[PDB]
RNA sequence: GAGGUAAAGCGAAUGAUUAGAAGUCUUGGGCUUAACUUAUUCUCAAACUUUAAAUAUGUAAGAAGUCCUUGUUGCUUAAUUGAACGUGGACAAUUGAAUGAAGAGCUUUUAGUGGGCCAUUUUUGGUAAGCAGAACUGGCGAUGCGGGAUGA
RNA sequence: GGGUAAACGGCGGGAGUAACUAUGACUCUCUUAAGGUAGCCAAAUGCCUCGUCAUCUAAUUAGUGACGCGCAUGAAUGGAU
RNA sequence: CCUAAGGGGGACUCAUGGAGAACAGAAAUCUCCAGUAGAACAAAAGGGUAAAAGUCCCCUUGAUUUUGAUUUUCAGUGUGAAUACAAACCAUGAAAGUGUGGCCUAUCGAUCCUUUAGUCCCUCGGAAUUUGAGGCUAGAGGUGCCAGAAAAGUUACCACAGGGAUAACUGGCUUGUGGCAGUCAAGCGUUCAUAGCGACAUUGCUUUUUGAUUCUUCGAUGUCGGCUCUUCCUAUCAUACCGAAGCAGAAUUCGGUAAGCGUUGGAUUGUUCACCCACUAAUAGGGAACGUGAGCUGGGUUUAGACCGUCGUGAGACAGGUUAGUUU
RNA sequence: GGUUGCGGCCAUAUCUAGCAGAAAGCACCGUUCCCCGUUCGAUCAACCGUAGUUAAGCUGCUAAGAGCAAUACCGAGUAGUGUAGUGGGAGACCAUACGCGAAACUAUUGUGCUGCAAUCU
RNA sequence: CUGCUACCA
RNA sequence: GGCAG
């Protein structure tokens, strides 16, 4: 017989971490979730009520509603060959601010502030980032690091 | 009764140990895993001498047990059954199913023995003794080999018995009074925990 | 697959100029066991672009075999000759993108000479897959 | 099961629209009427030669029903029903559970 | 004979509770219930009454929680009280009241809400919630936190409950918790309460114990007797405080007798340092040397 | 961000397991064996685990953005607080990573099909099978051509 | 409720013992009734089975004569001649 | 399954161990200390839970009303189950809060028909009144083959459409099993491992067994055995020549090259197989579509007749016995 | 800097065994008329701050402490793994090429930091 | 609780 | 699901 239930297969993935069981620090409940803020998805297998379905676990999206204890969080599923928009109903035990937009929004404040300094020093600067390029010539000095031979070793066994 | 071990030499299944869900699991053929002179102190015997596998390979319990009364039978012949101490370092803790003992329906097997899945470069067999008891040793061990299917080495060790320190590392341990005797093996000295109980565990240790 | 079209090598005995950085880099590891690449010459890279070079005007492969071509597509990034062109490439320039991608890939011929006696290997080890790092220029030698 | 035989819940009588006070009773399902349109057209098809004319279901699996209960208001008289789960045993204000005692 | 239950695989196993917990001073349960607000009021705080009773002390603060620390906004204690002429009995239950009177003016003056949500300016002891003006700004609204302490009819928080409530804050709370109330008839004798708020009981011990066992009378009250107070002027001392408190609820800091480098300075000289490695190595050499 | 597979671990929990040694028997019997306790020792786990990859996987990388000023509401706040949606203003092609782009987006309508099979790798049952069953990819089917003599 | 088997049919499981050994002549209890009687048999009906003994032959899974707790013989579903 | 085992609040802390207390002891009750849960939480297992989700106490009916949104299975249909709100009305608590059944993951049901509740509203069509009937909204009565027909057998008298998608031969893969052969060497063999054997183990070969599978054949490859005849294999029974012995001779046993050459007459059985009698140098084992039916034969099996026993109410079944049955 | 109240992170904070603690705070501490709760004013409630004490709680320090945390020319570029070949090998498996890369182990270091308010030798 | 009678989800 | 002993 096979078993297909709601929480089939969430042994370890709604598991407490090891040594973490039990009450929930309140700076969860201290945060404050508005329309539009990117959440990760993480389910609290102490909290019960408002728990999200086990595909929804590692998965970030969209708030678009705020209710008493909850938000409603929007998320992008593949369904075949496109994409269905699904709205999960989230208690905030399971929900956390996520972390790329706060290094994007740093990113446009310090593009900003780079700009216009070089607008008031007069010159130009180039905003995009790079990738990691091929490094430079240099010259390497040996004095007190005169090159060390080494060989290959003969076979031992050490049992 | 039993199939020719082929029918069982690789490790083709997952791990199958007696568990809360196989429960009626027949005993394996080999019971005792130490022999000889198994109380000897580990100033006794200095020479360890393995039998390694070259394999990644299944050894049943039966070839265990032959292997292991071969080698006793031969080195307490020669030798004296005081002479080593002799040590089985794999247990089968794999449990192999037979089926006929209808067609492929409902094909899963009953219990019908136990392996030790092996690796290769896995110690086998050990047995330490003195110096002058290695070519009995030896022979004992290389005796013991033809019971066992695939390729095997007789490796001499590095090490003083069955301790895990080179010859030389122990005799300067044993000097520098850092080891004490524990029946049959050996308590080493720490830089750890309580100095007073360590340095009263070990009177002899000269502090550098 | 993905990646070689990425590349544009859609075909065998292609050739395609890349800038190397840690994207780029990252992007033909992937397409190794599938490609052969290296460390290009002036005079390797000079040799292309006046044999087989040539660029894509309106989404068609037009011969490069004036630099009034060469202007009227590449002007606005100061590229005003085929000489130009080819140190735009050879000193990677500013505009290197624009000025690689208006080169259509090169379609090279088989070796003269034959490649090694089983390719799909890597050059290290006695094939001709991965980086020869400056074996390329023979190797085009060989192909153009 | 065991159910009291009062509650208090809403009461949707224009009158109340609020708790008050319910007595409740088992539903207990009502006779078949002759002159039911569907029992008239049921006993002209029956009528004549032709033998059974509808299906009899034979293929029974249950072996409980839901039970429902009659919560008449007793205010406004404005009766309300309520299904249970399927329960084997169900009694209506039988004795309540006693606990800290020997057998 | 049996297993020795403090292991390392114990201790490694151990899970700590929360700092606050093991100290048994914080239910996280109740905080949560406390703290949690309903998330479309997005940051607007919930305010806490916390009211906490030492040996000798009443606290009464009005806290907002945030996420690095929970923030004042007032704070009355009960040793500010001789300041409005209440020196003794500071911990009744009328010095609770006068404590939660004092609290709630206190913040009602910060806010700004004093012509409007004057309160219970006439206290008869009646169970009464500060109601909203029409038309202009809501009552400052308050829950209270009473920790740990239990609830009891007639117990003292309920009494910095009751004066906070008089003062204009808005607090909510039902009567059955008061001294005076009826649990069999379900009814509040409010004059009982006027008597708890006023010192009532307290002035009823020393009568009928000054008649009774004056030995006991002259160590339990003796504040009292060398004070000149009797139990006729008891209430008088509550009701002008009351009126006082009502005149300047403002908050007076104590001036401080030293600044504070200098009383770093002092305490730092009764703390012990912690020993250097070098330091605990060489007594761990000198140990080993002694032990030959 | 998420994960609990490979590996690892077991003088770490659970479960399994070999050997001695030192103590206590005070709640085992005949100096003794056996129990426990303590510090050690050999070996393990698809339905064990502190730890924990590689590959695979969610989101973001702007103009529908960021910042500044102040309008509406019956929601919300003790509030002149916010929530949402706005009026007005500033930041211009390095408008804010790479590579590519026979362009993107959208709609209607209808055919055949719904027996599959094979190879590498992962993998279950089975002694195994040109056996039976899954995962990812690539193929044959539907495909000729050069090679493997011959051969989906 | 009664009758009826030359109506259809049915006719079993259980519990102890004799001055060597072996065997057991020696009582009640259950299934909806009775519990296979007289006879006959490894029979065209017996699985085990090529049953065991005798006879027939140099030799017989055949035949005949015996035996019988008979898988599963049997009395006008007629028994034995 | 549960009026609490649902809801709210409060108080308390569990399994177990140690040390103590009349009867009292290993287990009754009392006390202290230790005790991260090693307890408990209706029921499988997993997860979760310690001033609780566990134990006890107090109050209760949120297991209520209205109809939308969402998650899972998914076609993004239904059903089941669950989640977050809106508008009411309540319970509980000092309060914040919490409560839309059971701590979470299972515990269930369309159309038609019937029945009940609600609105007491719409209709009975020439117009009315009162009965009756029919509508609208929500439950219940049930489909367990659980997206939901109303349903007993036999065919050995048989038929049809098909199927090598699928069984009953050969063949092919495999070789568990069957058969045959090695390696090691504890023992046996007066002594003595290895003349001859050889346990515990372990490596193979074969396709003369039987399985496993279902690739070919169901617009058909004639399915037992024997007779007849040819050929091939060798793992050699005999015959030739030899090596070894626990080889004195005689006989016998082990082994090598060897398939050149032979390997029988009969009683019983349809037999393959078997078992006896007898001769013989020996009475070896196998293959060739389990060689060989346009070569035969037809005793068996396996059409249709008939008998018996057991089974079945019966028609009938039996891979049980018996007798008769077209070989182009 | 000490202390209290309320906290954030939730052991670098826990645990064991010792030692010290000025000021204030906190605490133990005293009493039972009153509200209240118990077999028991022990817990819980109320009252005095009066009679006493830092003994304990609490805080800090000590320990080649257990635990925990962090770090690393520790182990180890090992185990494992993505990709490749008409590579090796009867096979079991292994090596090589281009990449990613642990855990245990070993050693060293550390042992709460901190927000708001009030207060203090 | 036995017998008889009845059977559109 | 109706009667009845
Ligand atoms: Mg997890
Ligand atoms: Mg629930
Ligand atoms: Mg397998
Ligand atoms: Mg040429
Ligand atoms: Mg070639
Ligand atoms: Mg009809
Ligand atoms: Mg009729
Ligand atoms: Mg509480
Ligand atoms: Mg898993
Ligand atoms: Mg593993
Ligand atoms: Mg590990
Ligand atoms: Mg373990
Ligand atoms: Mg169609
Ligand atoms: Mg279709
Ligand atoms: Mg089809
Ligand atoms: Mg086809
Ligand atoms: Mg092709
Ligand atoms: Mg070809
Ligand atoms: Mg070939
Ligand atoms: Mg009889
Ligand atoms: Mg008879
Ligand atoms: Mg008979
Ligand atoms: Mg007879
Ligand atoms: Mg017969
Ligand atoms: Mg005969
Ligand atoms: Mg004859
Ligand atoms: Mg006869
Ligand atoms: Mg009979
Ligand atoms: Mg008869
Ligand atoms: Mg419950
Ligand atoms: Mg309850
Ligand atoms: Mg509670
Ligand atoms: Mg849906
Ligand atoms: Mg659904
Ligand atoms: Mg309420
Ligand atoms: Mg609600
Ligand atoms: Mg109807
Ligand atoms: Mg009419
Ligand atoms: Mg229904
Ligand atoms: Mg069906
Ligand atoms: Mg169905
Ligand atoms: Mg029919
Ligand atoms: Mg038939
Ligand atoms: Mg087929
Ligand atoms: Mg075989
Ligand atoms: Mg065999
Ligand atoms: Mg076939
Ligand atoms: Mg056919
Ligand atoms: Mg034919
Ligand atoms: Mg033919
Ligand atoms: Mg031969
Ligand atoms: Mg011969
Ligand atoms: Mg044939
Ligand atoms: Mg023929
Ligand atoms: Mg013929
Ligand atoms: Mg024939
Ligand atoms: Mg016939
Ligand atoms: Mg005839
Ligand atoms: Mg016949
Ligand atoms: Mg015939
Ligand atoms: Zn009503």
Redesign the interface.
Known sequence: GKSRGYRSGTRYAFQRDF?????????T??????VGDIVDIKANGSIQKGMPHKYYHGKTGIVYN??????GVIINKVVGNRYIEKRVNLR?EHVKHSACRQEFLNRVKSNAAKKREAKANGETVYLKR?????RGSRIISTEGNIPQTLAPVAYE??? | ARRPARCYRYCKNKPYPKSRYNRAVPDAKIRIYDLGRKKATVDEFPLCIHLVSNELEQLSSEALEAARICANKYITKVSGRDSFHLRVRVHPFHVLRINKMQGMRGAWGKPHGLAARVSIGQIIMSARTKDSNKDVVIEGLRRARYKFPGQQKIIISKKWGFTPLNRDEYIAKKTNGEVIDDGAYVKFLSRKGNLEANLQQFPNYQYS | RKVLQLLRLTQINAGVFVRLTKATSELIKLAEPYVAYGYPSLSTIRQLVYKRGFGKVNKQRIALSDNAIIEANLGKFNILSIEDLIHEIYTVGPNFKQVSNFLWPFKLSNPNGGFRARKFQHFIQGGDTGNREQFINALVKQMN | VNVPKTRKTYCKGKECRKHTQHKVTQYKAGKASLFAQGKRRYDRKQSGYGGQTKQIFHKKAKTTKKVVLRLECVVCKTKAQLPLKRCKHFELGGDKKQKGQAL | MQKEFRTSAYHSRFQTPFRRRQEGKTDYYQRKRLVTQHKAKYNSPKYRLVVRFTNKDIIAQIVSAHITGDVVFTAAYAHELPRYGIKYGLTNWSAAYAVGLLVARRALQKLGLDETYTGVEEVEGEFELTEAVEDGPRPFKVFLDIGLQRTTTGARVFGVLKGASDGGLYVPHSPNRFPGWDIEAEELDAELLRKYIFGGHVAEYMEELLDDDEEKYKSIFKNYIEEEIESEDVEEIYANAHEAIRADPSFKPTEKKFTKEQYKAESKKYRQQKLTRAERQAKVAKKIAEFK
């Open positions: 040594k973490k069981h039990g009450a929930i620090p309140l700076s409940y201290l945060k404050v979730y508005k705020v209710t008493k204890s909850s938000v905030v790079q990738a990691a390029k091929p066994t050490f049992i």
